[model samples]
Target: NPYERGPDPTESSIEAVRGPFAVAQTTVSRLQADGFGGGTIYYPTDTSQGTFGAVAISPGFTAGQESIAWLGPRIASQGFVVITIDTITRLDQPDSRGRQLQAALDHLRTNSVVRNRIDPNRMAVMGHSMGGGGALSAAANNTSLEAAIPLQGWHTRKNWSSVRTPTLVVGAQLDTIAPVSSHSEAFYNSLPSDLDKAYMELRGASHLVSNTPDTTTAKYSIAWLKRFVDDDLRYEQFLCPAPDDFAISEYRSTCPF
Candidate 1:
């Protein structure tokens, strides 16, 4: 079912329906600290649909841009124009990390090749672990991003409160990399009550699973993107179901928290 458009595709705007689009891999320009520019695009793909909005992905510490390889197509399939930044140079440092994200946004906003295709107001930012912290910092710094998602990363009360955009914090209850109950909870508490926020803790998931190919978690990730980016409500229905519906249970929290 197409949530944003309703159960029927005919009900939604033709512009919102993206289909049968093949993934195209290409190099996009990005900034280098030396005042020089370079290309290291990874698994880049553009959908036939102009773009409902753009999704920017940041990788975690020690992780290359390829780490977010699976998410690009997955999100693109859902009608978003996805871009992932190669943050190897700024891996652990917050300032550099934030710059990497802004550079990508700048590239899209200013570049003649992509500026026409991107939706500036509908943008979303996401990251994993250190990348998550980076995503959060970038989102807080840039008012352009409409939503933010931090997957299994560190979240302090100050940073959480600083965020004014809608944020989703997903973590593994059994995470060995970060204390979900202690750290994640603190971050969740910081969001303003009026902001649209959701905190999900998967039962058997670990930090590694955040990037791993897990069918269940993938569905949730897709759902989250659809809900916020596309304004799809199927995600809400999929998560909330009747008690006797055994089939629906299969869709619930598949991520091994």
Candidate 2:
């Protein structure tokens, strides 16, 4: 694995609340930010690991950074630089949120104090609900991105055949707000068949499944980012064979990726 970092992978290690690296954080204020609402940056304190892949996350409709803040360090400690962001307005649409997600990644790459710690070319995007839809937007708009994960994303439109970035679209089987039958399932099927993609429907989960820190969500997310953004095949063990853990109601992917 050319971009691999940390130690060898294990089921216990990936499912742990934290990873091998110590973490530090800094807040981004709205006045100090450009193009998007300000939020926070969490990074591994160990600078010797070489530059890490960065991911920008956004919250759902009418939600703030606090809604998705738990993910910052959860993923960062696993050897990533994560930014949890606030949308320009609490009610911004998914497409607008998508542009903001890109802007946030740009800020992380060019202006943040941790820019030097980030591998600018190997970045990714993720979000919750509408923000999740925004993640798909970012991927469709920026093919240079290595990965994207949309957690229970809610969008009116679904076709994303143009997106070239490897994507993971998560959904909640019991969710009425953005049910898997209409939202996440359609989003996953819309992506290019030749492209790396996956759909994971959480059994008896709600639309806010990704809002808090959940073990099942974190493990797969970390695996996807590590596999795609970091190009770390060490995580392939967790992906291929398509995890049959009880938490997942259904899982689908174009494996051998």
Candidate 3:
């Protein structure tokens, strides 16, 4: 594929803490940022691969960028520009966080020092809890978004049928804050059946499962972003068969993706 980078895929590779590329990062201070509170940008030091797709991740309500910070280099080293962002305010709502996610992507596309490292046309969004809800809002409004992943998302607005972007909803089964019945599952079912999507609920996991490192989450997330963002088919093997990992409590999707 024209967008493909790194070595051919392997099961062990996706599950590792780091991918093939050497990673480097820089801070986006709040004072130098626009439209959203500042955060950090993680990118591959290799330029020979050409531009990589990018994902903008937001922290949940009342949380700082450090909460979802683990994902930055984890995905970036695999070949993508990742920015874990701080919402304009810690108390920002889902809709507001959504707008900030989009703005952060725009900033990464046009304003960051690593701008040339990203493929501006290929972009995605992700968030935890309320921020995850924001990711859904951002994708619903921005049809150009390549993908969106909401991790244990929380929002008052449930129906996300308007979203056309490829999405993956990662939920925690033991989460009471945003129960699977009312949030993740509801959000997944609302997406158009014809759209590429999937839902994976972690067995016995709390809402905080996404806060630290977890192998299953990392594997599928890398696969999803690679499959959709880079349009790289090599990673499709892990997703299309509908993964049956022991850590997952339940899985659903419009497969053959």
The runs of at least 3 residues in candidate 2 whose Cα sits more than 4 Å from the true structure, single-residue gaps closed, are none
Question: Poorest 10 consecutive residues of model 2 by lDDT?
Answer: 104-113
For candidate 2, write residues 1-257 as lDDT tens digits. 66898998898888888899999998888887787898899999898969899899999989999889999998999999998998888889999998988888888877657988988999999999999999999898999999999999989887898999999988988989888888999998888999988888888898877878788899999999999998889898888868968999898989978
lDDT of each: 0.58, 0.89, 0.92
Give candidate 3 regions above 4 Å deviation.
none
**Against the hidden reference, what TM-scores do the models get?**
0.75, 0.98, 0.98
Rank the models by lDDT, top first.
Answer: 3, 2, 1
Q: What lDDT does model 3 reach? A: 0.92
Query: How many pairs in model 2 have backbone atoms within 3 A of each other, for residues 3 or more apart or on separate chains, i.e. clashes?
Result: 0
How many residue-pair clashes does candidate 1 contain?
A: 6
Clashing pairs in 1: 202-257, 203-257, 204-256, 204-257, 205-256, 205-257
